Amino acid sequence: LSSLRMAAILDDQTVCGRGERLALALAREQINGIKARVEVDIFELQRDSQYETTDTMCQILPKGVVSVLGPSSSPASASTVSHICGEKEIPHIKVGPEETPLQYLRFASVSLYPSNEDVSLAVSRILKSFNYPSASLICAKAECLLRLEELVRGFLISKETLSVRMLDSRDPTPLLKEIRDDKVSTIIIDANASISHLVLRKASELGMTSAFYKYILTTMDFPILHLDGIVEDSSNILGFSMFNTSHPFYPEFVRSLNMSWRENCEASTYPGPALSAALMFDAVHVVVSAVRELNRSQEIGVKPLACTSANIWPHGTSLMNYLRMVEYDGLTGRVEFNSKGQRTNYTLRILEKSRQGHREIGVWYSN
Amino acid sequence: SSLRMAAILDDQTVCGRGERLALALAREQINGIIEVPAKARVEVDIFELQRDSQYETTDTMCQILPKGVVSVLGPSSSPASASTVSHICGEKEIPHIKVGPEETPRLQYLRFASVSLYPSNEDVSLAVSRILKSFNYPSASLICAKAECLLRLEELVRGFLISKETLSVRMLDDRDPTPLLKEIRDDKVSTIIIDANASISHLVLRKASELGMTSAFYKYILTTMDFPILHLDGIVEDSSNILGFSMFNTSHPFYPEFVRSLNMSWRENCEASTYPGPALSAALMFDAVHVVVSAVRELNRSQEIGVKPLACTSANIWPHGTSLMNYLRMVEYDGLTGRVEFNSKGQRTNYTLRILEKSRQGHREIGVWYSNR
Ligand SMILES: *[C@@H]1O[C@H](CO)[C@@H](O[C@@H]2O[C@H](CO)[C@@H](O)[C@H](O)[C@H]2NC(C)=O)[C@H](O)[C@H]1NC(C)=O
Ligand SMILES: *[C@@H]1O[C@H](CO)[C@@H](O[C@@H]2O[C@H](CO)[C@@H](O)[C@H](O)[C@H]2NC(C)=O)[C@H](O)[C@H]1NC(C)=O
Ligand SMILES: *[C@@H]1O[C@H](CO)[C@@H](O)[C@H](O)[C@H]1NC(C)=O
Ligand SMILES: *[C@@H]1O[C@H](CO)[C@@H](O)[C@H](O)[C@H]1NC(C)=O
Ligand SMILES: *[C@@H]1O[C@H](CO)[C@@H](O)[C@H](O)[C@H]1NC(C)=O
Ligand SMILES: *[C@@H]1O[C@H](CO)[C@@H](O)[C@H](O)[C@H]1NC(C)=O
Ligand SMILES: *[C@@H]1O[C@H](CO)[C@@H](O)[C@H](O)[C@H]1NC(C)=O
Ligand SMILES: *[C@@H]1O[C@H](CO)[C@@H](O)[C@H](O)[C@H]1NC(C)=O
Ligand SMILES: *[C@@H]1O[C@H](CO)[C@@H](O)[C@H](O)[C@H]1NC(C)=O
Ligand SMILES: *[C@@H]1O[C@H](CO)[C@@H](O)[C@H](O)[C@H]1NC(C)=O
Ligand code: NA
Ligand code: NA
């Protein structure tokens, strides 16, 4: 390798977005600033389209890359990337939830985002602390049944019930009213940061953020959900964080994304760093770590590939083995992978919203 | 000077589902009606897919667009390729007529591009739920061929989630459901729902039968709409309870000839196997041709419909396509698969499914599910 080139597919907006582009640039600058220079070629996705993602992959492969990162928030498209990466034997580095299918693509990818099973287990751990009550689940879309499959199977067998409602409309109010009528305390919200905020804002207006109710959010952007006027002194609103605020680069990461936001986005208030930005940063380090390790025992070369040819990257299988041996301390905590390419030996901090922000009330361990 | 549509097939030439023949039968029937003045002749250009791949499917669409078509039909059994066709049809504003199960999860931006003659997931779930009602709402086991069955059967799953009855879910490992079936056997729950295609459903029932699990205790409900072609000779006994659905209207005036024509083809070209009866996808393809012709002739009674070559690499759209979608969604047609009508989302509406039980003599009709009731 003359340069250590990888590609990143971004579905992030440039203005008032999650700062994934800057996070990639920060990782690159940090690694290079410390041989072959690291390059990250960035490709934009306008929407979640498998057909258009295929066109993007056909542009990427001829550039000679060692991995493809993302996208973080376009599940159909990410499944297409995994498929094509698998056929070409180029590693796919995932940084968002799979929503949520594929047995045959077992060795196409690794993912830095918590597995669906782990999120299900983490929510179930909280339900255990509640003495396993019946609950309601509010989903942005019906695919939540796939991502929370393990939780759903548990409720399908238990004595406790789970009432599921989909937003699929832009006002949760009527849905919350039905929950209130049911007189069930525990409400699980499965949605991204902005919809989660919308649901809680409307619950607040209906007086449903009082002490009677207990909310569990699945979004890993819980830390950047700022809930003033929504969160009451008596609220029980719990969620998760992957961030290791003790990682040496954490303050610099926060400040850099803050400055970028202040400069380009005057219409909204910077809430703090999005997890997908931190995952992108960590993904660059994971790829570089594995490639440099592989490069110690054998000769790596990159080659232009065509998406429609039968040709593969001869070194891809080996790189995937080295990726799955990586042990890395990142912004999102310890990064190690199991034989499915899922994060293992990591933690999720369990946070509760308070007046001033949030406080840590516990830790979930993947092991 | 003609009303030309294209059909994309993933079906074998011989010993297959008979889709190519069904398309020719629809065209012959429509062109055979005597009208004065003589109306435009119907043509169906047929393209075969050697595989379920965006690359091949895109190439096929690129061959189709310059031919000047008013709609593209199928493929029936390749959801990934069907989604590729929807994408390209949608960009060029040519209606896509779907005749197989929807991709699950659905790609939202492509919903507008098609109408579908195959029952929605919601409808399949409701029909299964209707059978469960007749068993007095029992606990059940669900056997899934694909990880997406919980989404396909969302209504049914949400129902079990608030019910006092339980649902155990087991996914098949991409060629022996035996271990899975032994687990169900130990649970001592009678009702087993199988969500799988025809060949995998047959495999599950065969392995169940080899475990002695097709005796009277067990009650099976199959989601496959090809239930009628499932031949379980040596698997089903008088005492078995194996239930499923049929879309076919055997009282449609062309039904006997449709079946005989597909049979004759089979007894000409497949001296090995025994003709199992008509595949649903073949009947859906037949009905799809009628639906397209009906909508196009109605659109054409006010506007002069022109058809020019388009191309994959050109941004040109067919100027009548978006309007044709409105007419397609308003078609009412009595077909081989029953009443064909659509709701505003392009899904089948106002139709029925027959509820059948397998017997040694084939199967027996035991009820009806009404989509509206
Ligand atoms: C969070 O998820 C919501 C709900 O799925 C997304 O909101 C949709 O966005 C599309 C495209 O902008 C709109 O056409 C829909 O009207 C929205 N639905 C609803 C219910 O609001 C939203 O895109 C996601 N937020 C982010 C930042 O990714
Ligand atoms: C019914 O489903 C099964 C798989 O779910 C299909 O069988 C597949 O056939 C091809 C060719 O051998 C392979 O890609 C898969 O490995 C097979 N799976 C299994 C388990 O056999 C079968 O083709 C489907 N039938 C139709 C017409 O859709
Ligand atoms: C691979 O090894 C060679 C020799 O040690 C070195 O020149 C090259 O920069 C290495 N590549 C990377 C990415 O470290
Ligand atoms: C952004 O930076 C400013 C200036 O230091 C600070 O006041 C603000 O709180 C920062 N935002 C976050 C969320 O850290
Ligand atoms: C966070 O980073 C610090 C500093 O490197 C490290 O000591 C600690 O183990 C990390 N914590 C977690 C939860 O990974
Ligand atoms: C898990 O990660 C920690 C760092 O957070 C590391 O010290 C430890 O060796 C790992 N434990 C196991 C069992 O792999
Ligand atoms: C449209 O109507 C005109 C007038 O009868 C006729 O020439 C033509 O056959 C029709 N076109 C189609 C495709 O039905
Ligand atoms: C197919 O043809 C055979 C031989 O002519 C006939 O006996 C049989 O009834 C037909 N099968 C069906 C399902 O119509
Ligand atoms: C079946 O076809 C007959 C004859 O055209 C028709 O009267 C009847 O309504 C149809 N039944 C269904 C269920 O569509
Ligand atoms: C639904 O279909 C039936 C049976 O073919 C038909 O007679 C009727 O007009 C339709 N009903 C409604 C409410 O449109
Ligand atoms: Na339950
Ligand atoms: Na239940």
XYZ file of C-alpha atoms in Angstrom, chain A residues 47-52 54 76 142-143 145-146 149 152-153 155-157 161-164 166 307-308, chain B residues 54-55 58 84 87-88 91 105 107 109 147-148 150-151 154 157-158 160-162 166-169 171:
50
model
C -31.655 8.808 0.533
C -32.062 5.203 1.722
C -32.070 3.478 -1.670
C -30.478 0.106 -2.381
C -30.399 0.870 -6.095
C -28.535 4.126 -5.540
C -25.275 -0.012 -5.598
C -31.622 -0.854 3.581
C -42.636 -1.598 12.596
C -39.040 -2.709 11.960
C -40.094 -5.696 16.052
C -37.066 -7.030 14.206
C -36.780 -9.400 18.351
C -40.489 -9.445 21.777
C -39.876 -13.200 22.005
C -42.854 -11.064 26.026
C -44.471 -13.600 23.663
C -43.793 -16.334 26.252
C -48.071 -8.168 28.200
C -46.463 -5.721 25.785
C -48.731 -3.291 23.958
C -47.050 -2.125 20.746
C -46.316 2.485 15.712
C -18.679 -4.243 -8.812
C -20.053 -6.500 -11.556
C -29.552 -5.880 -9.461
C -26.988 -6.103 -12.259
C -31.002 -3.541 -14.452
C -34.941 -3.054 -8.708
C -36.916 1.653 -8.747
C -36.376 1.948 -12.483
C -37.865 6.861 -12.175
C -39.334 -4.526 5.310
C -38.800 0.340 0.811
C -39.850 5.648 -1.434
C -35.890 -13.667 10.070
C -38.506 -11.179 8.799
C -42.267 -11.166 12.892
C -42.637 -8.115 10.657
C -46.929 -7.897 12.749
C -47.619 -10.844 16.819
C -49.043 -7.711 18.448
C -50.265 -12.446 20.916
C -48.264 -9.811 22.803
C -51.334 -8.580 24.713
C -48.285 -17.624 24.176
C -46.375 -17.753 20.859
C -43.011 -19.508 20.549
C -40.976 -18.417 17.555
C -36.409 -19.679 12.665
